[PDB]
Amino acid sequence: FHVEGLIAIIVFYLLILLVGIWAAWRRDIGLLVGGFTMTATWVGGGYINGTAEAVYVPGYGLAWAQAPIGYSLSLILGGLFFAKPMRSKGYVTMLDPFQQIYGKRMGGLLFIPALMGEMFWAAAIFSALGATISVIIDVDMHISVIISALIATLYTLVGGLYTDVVQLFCIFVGLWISVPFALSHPAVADIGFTAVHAKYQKPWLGTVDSSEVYSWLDSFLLLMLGGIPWQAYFQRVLSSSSATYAQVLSFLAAFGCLVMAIPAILIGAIGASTDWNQTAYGLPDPKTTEEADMILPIVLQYLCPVYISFFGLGAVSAAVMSSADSSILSASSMFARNIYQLSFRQNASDKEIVWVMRITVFVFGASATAMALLTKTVYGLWYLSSDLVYIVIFPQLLCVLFVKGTNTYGAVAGYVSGLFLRITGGEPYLYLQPLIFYPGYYPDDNGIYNQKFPFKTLAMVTSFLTNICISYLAKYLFESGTLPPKLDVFDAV
Numbered sequence: 216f217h218v219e220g221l222i223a224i225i226v227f228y229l230l231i232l233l234v235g236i237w238a239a240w241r242r243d244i245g246l247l248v249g250g251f252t253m254t255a256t257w258v259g260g261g262y263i264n265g266t267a268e269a270v271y272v273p274g275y276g277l278a279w280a281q282a283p284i285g286y287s288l289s290l291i292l293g294g295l296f297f298a299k300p301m302r303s304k305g306y307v308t309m310l311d312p313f314q315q316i317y318g319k320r321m322g323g324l325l326f327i328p329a330l331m332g333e334m335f336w337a338a339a340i341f342s343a344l345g346a347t348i349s350v351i352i353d354v355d356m357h358i359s360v361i362i363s364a365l366i367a368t369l370y371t372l373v374g375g376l377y378t379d380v381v382q383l384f385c386i387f388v389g390l391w392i393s394v395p396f397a398l399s400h401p402a403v404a405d406i407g408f409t410a411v412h413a414k415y416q417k418p419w420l421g422t423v424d425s426s427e428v429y430s431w432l433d434s435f436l437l438l439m440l441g442g443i444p445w446q447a448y449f450q451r452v453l454s455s456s457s458a459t460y461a462q463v464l465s466f467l468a469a470f471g472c473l474v475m476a477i478p479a480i481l482i483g484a485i486g487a488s489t490d491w492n493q494t495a496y497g498l499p500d501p502k503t504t505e506e507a508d509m510i511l512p513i514v515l516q517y518l519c520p521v522y523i524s525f526f527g528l529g530a531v532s533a534a535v536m537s538s539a540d541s542s543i544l545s546a547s548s549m550f551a552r553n554i555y556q557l558s559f560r561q562n563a564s565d566k567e568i569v570w571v572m573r574i575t576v577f578v579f580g581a582s583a584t585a586m587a588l589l590t591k592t593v594y595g596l597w598y599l600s601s602d603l604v605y606i607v608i609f610p611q612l613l614c615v616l617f618v619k620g621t622n623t624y625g626a627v628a629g630y631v632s633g634l635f636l637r638i639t640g641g642e643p644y645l646y647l648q649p650l651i652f653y654p655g656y657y658p659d660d661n662g663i664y665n666q667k668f669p670f671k672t673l674a675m676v677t678s679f680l681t682n683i684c685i686s687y688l689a690k691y692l693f694e695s696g697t698l699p700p701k702l703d704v705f706d707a708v
């Protein structure tokens with residue numbers, strides 16, 4: 216349990232770093248590597264445990280595996296539409312549009328939500344690696360996450376003195392070497408049978424009532440429109456010189472997302488359909504014990520033979536550990552650099568980068584660990600990340616680039632309106648009891664009060680409308696008399 220897991224993880228991390236430096240030492244092909252790396256930005260750590268939750272958990276099923284189909288569609292929406300109206304106007308990074316119209320100050324107030332979103336994502340990755348380690352070396356839930364994240368952040372500490380391709384290859388080989396074998400286990404029954412007929416559990420094929428179809432469309436639109444905005448995607452496409460190449464790149468990344476989601480769904484489906492009274496895990500099921508998180512590492516380690524298991528499971532753990540470094544470094548660096556330049560001015564010569572990035576990266580890792588420690592879901596963290604991004608960033612991104620005449624008053628008005636309409640409406644994974652109680656709430660765990668009336672999409676739309684309304688109203692009273700131009704907090708005249 217302990218020794219085999221530790222040696223497997225160490226060996227595979229050594230081998231992945233070795234291949235990385237083999238690359239870093241030293242056409243007809245350029246569609247391959249770019250598409251694979253840009254889909255490697257999303258896939259990895261996230262999907263496998265997230266969609267494992269989505270499929271395995273009773274009641275939700277496939278029809279509630281929103282993100283594994285949500286993001287791919289998100290990629291197409293980002294490319295097929297926003298590929299054009301940023302090339303022609305010309306922009307270097309997504310930092311630029313906000314700091315071009317909204318002065319310079321407004322940008323940091325806008326990009327704090329991006330920090331919190333990628334903080335959610337980093338917490339999800341840390342939770343996934345904690346579960347994988349807690350299965351491979353079978354220690355604990357508190358111990359695995361803290362050990363994992365401390366090592367990850369202290370390695371990213373001196374990580375400053377391509378590898379994203381080998382991540383996907385390891386992920387693909389690891390899943391596609393276990394599932395053909397686990398599906399053969401006598402403990403498992405026909406994956407088709409429990410899909411439609413519900414022999415040993417509710418059908419792992421998701422079921423949605425006509426009543427909460429509004430909530431289903433809320434979640435779908437949230438994920439689909441909250442994937443586009445984020446920084447890594449814009450940074451990648453903007454660094455691509457030719458436009459059509461970006462469209463084919465979006466096609467290929469969405470296809471990579473969808474193909475890598477195929478082995479991940481079947482893993483959770485087997486985990487659900489399996490008769491657990493035969494395996495050596497004990498009759499207490501992953502739901503009847505508060506450990507539904509670990510369903511994928513559990514099905515790999517226990518429902519596969521000893522020799523096959525460590526290849527795939529160590530590959531998964533090593534890949535997600537590697538992704539942790541990139542996510543942590545990028546998330547801390549962008550905030551520190553942008554907002555520190557923002558505040559009044561600060562010498563970047565020989566203090567800012569090292570000192571500020573150090574402080575921010577350490578505290579960011581600590582906070583990601585702290586919130587990944589209490590939430591026993593990863594699908595929930597995803598939802599929360601894309602949820603906040605959808606609430607705040609996307610409306611103003613869409614009005615800045617697709618709409619004309621947007622101004623700085625609209626930025627603050629949309630910010631306040633969106634944030635209020637979201638936080639006041641309640642959040643069910645944490646204990647955010649709502650204050651409004653939109654028609655359609657159902658009694659639950661007193662932490663979960665879902666309103667079938669979509670308020671997330673309503674908040675997004677009304678924040679965009681608030682931006683437009685206050686912007687053009689202030690533009691209309693631009694004048695003397697009508698709050699004369701003497702009164703001017705953020706410049707528009």
Ligand SMILES: *[C@@H]1O[C@H](CO)[C@@H](O[C@@H]2O[C@H](CO)[C@@H](O[C@@H]3O[C@H](CO)[C@@H](O)[C@H](O)[C@@H]3O)[C@H](O)[C@H]2NC(C)=O)[C@H](O)[C@H]1NC(C)=O
Pocket residue numbers: 492493
């Ligand atoms: C899986 O579940 C089954 C049943 O849900 C468990 O198997 C049963 O275990 C008992 C205890 O050894 C076996 O003895 C039986 O006990 C009852 C108690 O009332 C008695 O009336 C019977 O005459 C008999 O002595 C029982 O035969 C056995 N049933 C079967 C079908 O094997 C089992 O412990 C669970 N876990 C596994 C199989 O890992």
